[PDB]
Amino acid sequence: GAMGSMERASLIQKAKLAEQAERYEDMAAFMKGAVEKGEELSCEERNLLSVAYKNVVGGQRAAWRVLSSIEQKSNEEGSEEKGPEVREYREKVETELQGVCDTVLGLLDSHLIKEAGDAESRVFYLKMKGDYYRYLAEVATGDDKKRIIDSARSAYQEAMDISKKEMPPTNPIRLGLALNFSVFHYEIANSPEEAISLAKTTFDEAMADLHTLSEDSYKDSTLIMQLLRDNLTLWT
Amino acid sequence: GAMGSMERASLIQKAKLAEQAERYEDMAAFMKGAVEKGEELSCEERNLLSVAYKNVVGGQRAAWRVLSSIEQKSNEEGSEEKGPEVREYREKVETELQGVCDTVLGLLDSHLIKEAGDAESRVFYLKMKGDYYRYLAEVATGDDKKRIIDSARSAYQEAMDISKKEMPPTNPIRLGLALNFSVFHYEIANSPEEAISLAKTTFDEAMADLHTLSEDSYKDSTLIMQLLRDNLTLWT
């Protein structure tokens, strides 16, 4: 790996610089190098890893949606034949997106998840596993689409089971997991009622636990609760 | 070149798709491939080339400025020694920026400028040559900084000489050239009075020619005139 000669601490320092410079591909490469040093990641380091790849894949997803929309309009009755270029370029972006997802899933499998014993780390990584399988599902169309969907579901479900046993209902990781699993239900699994039920129950159980929190924790939790509420407003 | 097997028309089509998807690195690679087919570029194609590279280098410049600011704060009295990482990463971004500038300058030299005979194409490419030498000057610190600055100045000056002979004072290419040369004077050449004089004269001569224009051309010209006015307001 091109980061193999750089100190772990230097990779983390440069990931933070890359974030400040909005250089998310660099940020992700630095964090991949840091993971590949083989040591577990601190909470701060896990968040750097997630921010970097979420930004990279987010740009790819947005581009893929633009191109997929153009491609779909091209196959509508009365559209002129423009040749293979739209499909080819959509496929190019798709393959790059899949490659990033495979890279993240590879880091999680080798060996972040298996060494993660604390609830906060294990839930974080299993949520990430669900997210990156979800991104693969968004572009899947062939035989394996059902298996990709089931992989996302299984990762999210294991994360949910741990989070419900080991974390309070206001914990921001637990809340973000529930948010993303509800989006999985709505957008991927064709289960809008499950999505709505999960978002509602998560919101209500968090609301009931806010009284236990400091001002700063209250701010953190209510921010994510508002995202649950925003989705409920859109979906109902 | 990786684009050598793709049809010219397909490269242009994909450049337009990449623009819609905000995939500017892809856009630039497609347009580089199109240039390397060896045919002259139409007005639309020249603008695709410029948009692509301006976006790529613009992101690099913004990142370089963030990192350079952090590096300068690190060398201020009482700042802790953080090691070589800030300098290293600033240098990495700088080298990538220089590489993009060298790529654009290489396309202009081989062989866009020498085949450009019409004023609109020749001025466009010489303005680009000035711009990319200007971006190199922004990061230059060694022996060649004076020579880089003079290369930018010479390209802009040749473009100005042609534009004044061959184009009306409201022509948007002429206006954008004057805008950028005035920025060169202010930011690069330590000549704020020259910058102000150029922006003022350009604005006033365009104003006097607006009466000759259609509604659509008037909109195009006045948009750039407002940019000249914005700089004058900042500089005076």
UniProtKB/Swiss-Prot annotation, chains A, B:
Homodimer. Interacts with KRT17 and SAMSN1. Found in a complex with XPO7, EIF4A1, ARHGAP1, VPS26A, VPS29 and VPS35. Interacts with GAB2. Interacts with SRPK2. Interacts with COPS6. Interacts with COP1; this interaction leads to proteasomal degradation. Interacts with the 'Thr-369' phosphorylated form of DAPK2. Interacts with PI4KB. Interacts with SLITRK1. Interacts with LRRK2; this interaction is dependent on LRRK2 phosphorylation. InterPro entries: 14-3-3, 14-3-3_CS, 14-3-3_dom_sf, 14-3-3_domain, 14-3-3_sigma. Ubiquitinated. Ubiquitination by RFFL induces proteasomal degradation and indirectly regulates p53/TP53 activation. The gene is SFN. SUPFAM superfamilies: 14-3-3 protein. The lineage of its organism: Eukaryota, Metazoa, Chordata, Craniata, Vertebrata. Pfam families: 14-3-3 (PF00244). PANTHER family: 14-3-3 PROTEIN. It is found in: Cytoplasm; Nucleus; Secreted. This is 14-3-3 protein sigma. Present mainly in tissues enriched in stratified squamous keratinizing epithelium. It comes from the Eukaryota. Adapter protein implicated in the regulation of a large spectrum of both general and specialized signaling pathways. Binds to a large number of partners, usually by recognition of a phosphoserine or phosphothreonine motif. Binding generally results in the modulation of the activity of the binding partner. Promotes cytosolic retention of GBP1 GTPase by binding to phosphorylated GBP1, thereby inhibiting the innate immune response. Also acts as a TP53/p53-regulated inhibitor of G2/M progression. The modification Phosphoserine is found at S10, S79. It comes from Homo sapiens (Human).
